[PDB]
């Protein structure tokens, strides 16, 4: 089975990117793998880790234990053939394909699952199979697998309510959506804070709360923020036990920019080494900062930049270069003058922006359709 194994994948990543982290993980992962007969995830990982010369005895005895279990399973297959119910061979093979998945590689488990999908005549066991496939795809990041299995699950779920199954699919889809840099979709699909059980993929309900507040920081604006994530007591009571995130959110809401930056630095440091946030952990940060600027410049019109030093962070030249590079990018509409050290604002209409994206997406689609035109017809 794959209920406890998720954390193992985490440790794998923890030994890949952190070069300095090479002391304790190599050991706890090691004796987590020595039990449970986990033979697959350290064929190549053994090469990634130390030489580990003393394994041939362990390798041989472990693989012979695997063979003993597999021959036992074949024994029950032939036992179930003569006196069968719903072809209990297929019941047993479905019941032990997860064992093979826990021990072996993708090929055997996938073939066993695709063959045993035809025995089950009820929707519940089909959904269990589909969820197994989602989980393995999340381990090995198989995009087409994820897409096809999700559309199959959605096509299987409308027959019957299964609202608990529907919520489980929602959490899975949200996890996939955070990995891709789609954040609004995450925040929309992470509003299931009253229907998330102590699941097998997120050991902590509190980790789920932290993820949803993190994405809601980016996705939504001030009315919804002030209306949903701050007025829903089900997460306020949880946040009461998490002072750091509470003050991180309150700092942004209450405009205490001085304390905001230390909390932001702590958060980005923590999420740099966390899974499914590292590949773009910088991107996230570069949003929040610019967002903070947009939360202050629109109230006034002729604010001096000196005020920032004692209100946002010391250093005139730092703020100067930051604002310069942010203006050059085409966002944060304003203007600055150096001879008198002043910052002015402007109000561009919501038409020019609604035009550039149109023209560029049109360009890319036209390029794609031209490529399609010539690739066909010799």
């Amino acid at each position: 089975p794959k209920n406890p194994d998720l954390r193992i994948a985490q440790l794998r990543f923890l030994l890949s990117l952190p070069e300095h982290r090479g002391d304790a993980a190599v050991r706890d992962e090691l004796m987590a793998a020595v039990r449970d007969n986990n033979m697959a995830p350290y064929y190549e990982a053994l090469c990634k880790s130390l030489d580990w010369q003393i394994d041939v005895d362990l390798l041989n005895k472990m693989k012979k234990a695997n063979e003993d279990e597999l021959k036992r399973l074949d024994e029950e297959l032939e036992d179930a053939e003569k006196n069968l119910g719903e072809s209990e061979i297929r019941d047993a093979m479905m019941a032990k394909a997860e064992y093979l998945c826990r021990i072996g590689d993708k090929e055997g488990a996938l073939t066993a699952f695709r063959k045993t999908y035809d025995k089950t005549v009820a929707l519940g066991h089909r959904l269990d199979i589909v969820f197994y496939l989602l989980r393995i795809g999340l381990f090995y990041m198989d995009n087409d697998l994820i897409t096809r299995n999700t559309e199959k699950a959605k096509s299987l779920i409308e027959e019957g309510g299964d609202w608990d199954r529907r919520n489980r699919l929602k959490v899975y889809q949200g996890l996939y959506c955070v990995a891709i840099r789609d954040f609004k979709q995450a925040a929309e699909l992470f509003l299931d804070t009253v229907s998330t059980f102590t699941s097998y993929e997120l050991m902590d309900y509190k980790t789920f709360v932290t993820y949803t507040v993190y994405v809601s920081m980016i996705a939504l604006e001030r009315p919804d923020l002030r209306e949903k994530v701050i007025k829903g007591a089900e997460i306020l009571e949880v946040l009461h036990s998490l002072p750091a995130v509470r003050q991180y959110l309150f700092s942004l809401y209450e405009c205490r920019y001085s304390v905001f930056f230390q909390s932001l630095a702590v958060v980005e440091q923590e999420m740099k080494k966390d899974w499914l946030f590292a590949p773009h952990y910088r991107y996230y940060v570069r949003e929040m900062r610019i967002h903070a600027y947009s939360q202050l410049l629109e109230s006034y019109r002729s604010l001096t930049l000196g005020y920032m030093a004692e209100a946002f962070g010391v250093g005139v030249e730092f703020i100067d270069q930051e604002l310069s590079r942010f203006i050059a990018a085409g966002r944060l509409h304003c203007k600055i003058d150096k001879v008198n050290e002043i910052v002015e604002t402007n109000r561009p209409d919501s038409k020019n922006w609604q035009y550039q994206e149109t023209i560029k997406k049109g360009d890319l689609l036209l390029n794609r359709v031209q490529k399609l035109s010539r690739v066909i017809n010799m």
């Binding site: 310069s324 203006i327 050059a328 203007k335 600055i336 003058d337 150096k338 001879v339 008198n340 002015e344 402007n346 561009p348 209409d349 038409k351 020019n352 035009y355 023209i359 049109g362 360009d363 036209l366 359709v369 031209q370 490529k371 035109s373 010539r374 017809n377 010799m378």
Partner: protein, 479 residues
Amino acid sequence: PPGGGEQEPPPPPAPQDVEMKEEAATGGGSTGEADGKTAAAAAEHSQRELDTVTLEDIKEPRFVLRALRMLPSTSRRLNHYVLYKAVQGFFTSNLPFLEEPMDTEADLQFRPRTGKAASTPLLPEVEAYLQLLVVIFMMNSKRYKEAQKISDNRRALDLVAAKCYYYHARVYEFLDKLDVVRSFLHARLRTATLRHDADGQATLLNLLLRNYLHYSLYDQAEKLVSKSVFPEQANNNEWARYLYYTGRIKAIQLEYSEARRTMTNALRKAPQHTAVGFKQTVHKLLIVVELLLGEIPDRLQFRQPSLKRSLMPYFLLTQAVRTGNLAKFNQVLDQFGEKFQADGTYTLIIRLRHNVIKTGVRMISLSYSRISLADIAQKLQLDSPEDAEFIVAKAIRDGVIEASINHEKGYVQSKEMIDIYSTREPQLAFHQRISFCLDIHNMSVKAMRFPPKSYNKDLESAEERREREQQDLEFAKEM
């Protein structure tokens, strides 16, 4: 002896067998098809030649003594194939493979056939290690081919000879002179293009241009006036390299607007095959020239496995040029100058300073609104403030920025130009692609009606049912 008895025997028989239908059957079908009918390209089997070239590239006494003087000799050719196979199985076979086409009744009676047969020895002799088939001897075989070239009747010979005088060039390319190859090609070009239109106005042009540039003379006179610009028949393989060559020619003469489009078309004409030899070069140039032309980003990030290792310097280069800093540009040039020289591209990128300074000044103009020139120099590290005035003045000249300058004071103030939606330019932008989207529909519809054919089936209802209907009507009208 035991080692060479199981894996050495297999090499002999199986390749011969699979060749008996690959080129022997191909030659037999071409003789009665290419030289037997006017299908030309169709029964010329240029794709059979293609396949038998590409497969044999990564793959003679029997096949050189082919006979066809009389019908019994032509029939014999095929049993003699098996006879030579048996001799090879029993006995060991063998300059002495050049007089056979004049002997052994060798009377193909088709030049289209004897040409391909002769070329097939040349290709292996060219690929005979690096020996070059005893050097000039391969050339001498091709000298024989060149005698064949002058033999004649080109309803097949022309498109057969194209490949011939394409490998012919490679022969000299790997060895000695090329100037007299140029003389020969020049002559051969007007030897063609005068027999009405015969093609080759594609291959010969590329052969002439391949090393016209390599000798480093950028003559262009004849290219602007060349009448062979439009062969229109290139099999979508010649056209790509022709466009690449003319694009580089155009770009080397301070012309950037048209080179981008023509050579992008050339690059996107490239086939799907795994080999990425020329695509490396075309990509490299296609992004140098885009950096030169204004400041188009070009950073359509390429991380494909094939191209990743090669273009590592260029990525660093674009990184410096996008930013307004100038010390980074020098720190990249002094580091990769030798590498760029090995690539033959130092001269193009050595003139990039003006683009860097334009980008920097445009960024400064867009960012601020009123800035003293006593800091522009420090930000752009020109080491002097006075010349910054001239730089900004030249920028204002070309419409880069509309900012004014108070010279007596020193600060530069810029105008504010917003609301481009009311301007006429977005209508032009929409029109420029309305034209394209209207053209593609006509292009697609034009070729739709070619596949519909052989629709002679035209029946309305029946033939003999009319009599039955009339009889029934008469019977009904009687009562």
